[PDB]
User: Fold this.
Amino acid sequence: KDCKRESNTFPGICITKPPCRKACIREKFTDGHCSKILRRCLCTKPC
Amino acid sequence: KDCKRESNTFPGICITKPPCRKACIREKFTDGHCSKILRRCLCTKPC
Amino acid sequence: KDCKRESNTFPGICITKPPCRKACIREKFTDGHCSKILRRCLCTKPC
Amino acid sequence: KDCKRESNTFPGICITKPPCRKACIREKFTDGHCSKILRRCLCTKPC
Amino acid sequence: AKDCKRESNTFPGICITKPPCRKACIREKFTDGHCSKILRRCLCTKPC
Amino acid sequence: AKDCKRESNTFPGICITKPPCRKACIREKFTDGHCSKILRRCLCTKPC
Ligand SMILES: CCCCCC(=O)OC[C@H](COP(=O)(O)O)OC(=O)CCCCC
Ligand SMILES: CCCCCC(=O)OC[C@H](COP(=O)(O)O)OC(=O)CCCCC
Ligand SMILES: CCCCCC(=O)OC[C@H](COP(=O)(O)O)OC(=O)CCCCC
Ligand SMILES: CCCCCC(=O)OC[C@H](COP(=O)(O)O)OC(=O)CCCCC
Ligand SMILES: CCCCCC(=O)OC[C@H](COP(=O)(O)O)OC(=O)CCCCC
Ligand SMILES: CCCCCC(=O)OC[C@H](COP(=O)(O)O)OC(=O)CCCCC
Assistant:
């Protein structure tokens, strides 16, 4: 399974995936996705 | 902030910290804690 | 474009699409999706 | 519960209701109202 | 002589419905308040 | 925070430049006035 950490750079409410993914790759993770409930951008990468 | 990944070795319900921390350090993380709701053992390490 | 209405039969909170789609098809709509903040099951069909 | 979808015939910006309702009734809905931010004309009808 | 008007100095966030804006504006000693339809500011009004 | 604003009751015609509007508004016991950008109304301003 992957490691996960909230994005430090993504601003505002996480609505769609691509912007979150882009922030997370800029933060040297491999993907990102919006949290379904709190709408935070969560980055993921192999641990 | 630290990365998080659920423990792959901790059995059953996460009640207190020490057993989860011990499992997570064996998995080469630096700490572990119980998730307050689902009672999963969550390993943490800098990433 | 499609008309949209909240599901009358979907119980609980909308987490993933397929359970919502299933309920919406039961109600004679063609698809369903989760609303992003309130997590409602919203059915869609041709108007 | 009413079905909703954007007017296909209402031109321009929805400021007040009557012109949107009128367009929506022409489109065989039963009412219309402006959306708050985008100022779309949204038609509604029993579904 | 229409009413005097200015933006609420206490209403937070986006003005969506009228009652919360009117409530803020009466606390500021105006007689009413309403959301501006385009910018969604809470605007207070009073005879003046 | 911002001043109260109200259309002038005495300013005739269309608001082109500020000084004639400011002068009419001070007569009306406001502290300033200015032209609205599109409709070219003379808008008077004063603390609420
Ligand atoms: C598919 C297009 C229309 C329906 C979309 C919808 O209902 O939102 C997706 C919902 C969840 O909502 P969001 O992830 O917040 O967009 O359910 C899923 O199946 C995604 C599952 C988890 C994805 C990781
Ligand atoms: C009934 C006679 C006409 C009154 C016109 C009016 O109410 O303004 C139009 C409103 C405009 O929206 P507001 O920002 O709420 O003023 O839209 C509606 O259709 C009502 C509900 C949705 C609000 C967008
Ligand atoms: C009527 C309650 C909805 C919340 C406040 C409101 O009156 O209208 C907001 C509208 C939604 O109005 P509804 O169609 O009823 O959902 O949407 C927007 O903000 C802009 C466009 C996107 C969605 C239409
Ligand atoms: C006639 C309906 C009841 C009261 C008036 C009203 O509709 O709301 C105040 C209006 C609405 O516009 P906003 O305040 O920007 O929302 O203010 C004006 O711009 C007109 C002032 C006059 C100069 C343009
Ligand atoms: C309302 C005028 C106030 C200030 C002067 C101005 O705005 O320039 C236009 C002036 C205004 O004159 P009046 O309309 O007579 O007031 O010249 C014209 O009338 C031609 C337009 C014909 C309009 C009927
Ligand atoms: C930013 C304020 C809103 C604009 C209204 C205003 O200031 O009224 C005066 C007008 C405004 O006209 P605009 O160019 O359209 O802004 O300016 C003048 O030319 C007067 C010269 C002397 C002083 C400007």
